Amino acid sequence: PQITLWKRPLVTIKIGGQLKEALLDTGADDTVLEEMNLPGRWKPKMIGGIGGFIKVRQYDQILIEICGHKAIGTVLVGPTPVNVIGRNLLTQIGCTLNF
Amino acid sequence: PQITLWKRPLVTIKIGGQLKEALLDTGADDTVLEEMNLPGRWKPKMIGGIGGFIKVRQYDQILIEICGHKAIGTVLVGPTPVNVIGRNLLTQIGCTLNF
Numbered sequence: 001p002q003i004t005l006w007k008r009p010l011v012t013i014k015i016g017g018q019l020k021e022a023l024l025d026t027g028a029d030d031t032v033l034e035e036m037n038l039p040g041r042w043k044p045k046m047i048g049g050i051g052g053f054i055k056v057r058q059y060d061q062i063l064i065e066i067c068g069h070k071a072i073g074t075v076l077v078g079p080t081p082v083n084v085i086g087r088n089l090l091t092q093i094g095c096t097l098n099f
Numbered sequence: 100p101q102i103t104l105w106k107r108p109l110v111t112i113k114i115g116g117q118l119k120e121a122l123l124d125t126g127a128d129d130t131v132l133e134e135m136n137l138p139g140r141w142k143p144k145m146i147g148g149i150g151g152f153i154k155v156r157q158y159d160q161i162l163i164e165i166c167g168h169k170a171i172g173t174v175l176v177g178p179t180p181v182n183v184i185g186r187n188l189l190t191q192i193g194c195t196l197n198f
């Protein structure tokens with residue numbers, strides 16, 4: 001499909017057997033999701049943006065489904081203000097910018 | 100053009116007659132550029148990112164050319180980690196997400 005940018009590019013994702021809303025974010029190197037108690041090991045990490053850095057938990061080889069398109073990669077979990085799907089997963093669903 | 104996301108979607112912009120590199124950022128509502136000198140009046144404003152809020156200078160109806168495409172809109176200037184082109188200008192140049 002094609003998504004215009006008049007409004008925030010919000011889509012439904014499936015992760016850890018749960019459905020959530022997330023932003024398709026070409027400005028995000030990595031995927032950052034709201035607090036959720038995913039199973040398995042993780043490693044601490046700090047990511048920075050406008051306003052400074054926050055602490056997140058890095059989970060690897062996590063399966064996410066975005067608009068029916070499956071992807072597997074690293075997901076960062078922490079007190080993020082919004083769920084963002086970053087380039088690490090957007091590439092896997094064949095997402096491009098076009099103008 | 101069509102831009103893939105294996106690398107950061109960085110493009111050259113022209114603003115205030117000066118060339119700069121900026122990030123096409125579908126997760127940003129607004130356009131935020133690093134500290135620079137622009138002519139005309141400006142109003143102080145606040146914007147919040149992943150790590151909190153920063154103080155910016157809001158310039159309205161500024162001419163900005165993005166990858167050869169002209170736009171005239173609001174540009175925020177402040178301590179952002181990188182120049183980001185937000186949806187307020189991405190819509191003007193006809194940019195969409197596609198997968």
Ligand SMILES: CCOP(=O)(COc1ccc(C[C@H](NC(=O)O[C@H]2CO[C@H]3OCC[C@H]32)[C@H](O)CN(C[C@@H](C)CC)S(=O)(=O)c2ccc(OC)cc2)cc1)OCC
Pocket residue numbers: 025026027028029030031032047048049050081082084086122124125126127128129130131146147148149150151152180181183185
């Ligand atoms: C406490 C305030 O509360 P808020 O709820 C905050 O909400 C939001 C917070 C963040 C975003 C997404 C970011 N957009 C953003 O900063 O946009 C600003 C300007 O335009 C406004 O629109 C939304 C916010 C304002 C951006 O797309 C991606 N980022 C990096 C960019 C900056 C290049 C370095 S990154 O997230 O930091 C990030 C860093 C490293 C990563 O992997 C290693 C992964 C992600 C969207 C909404 O209030 C405002 C809505």
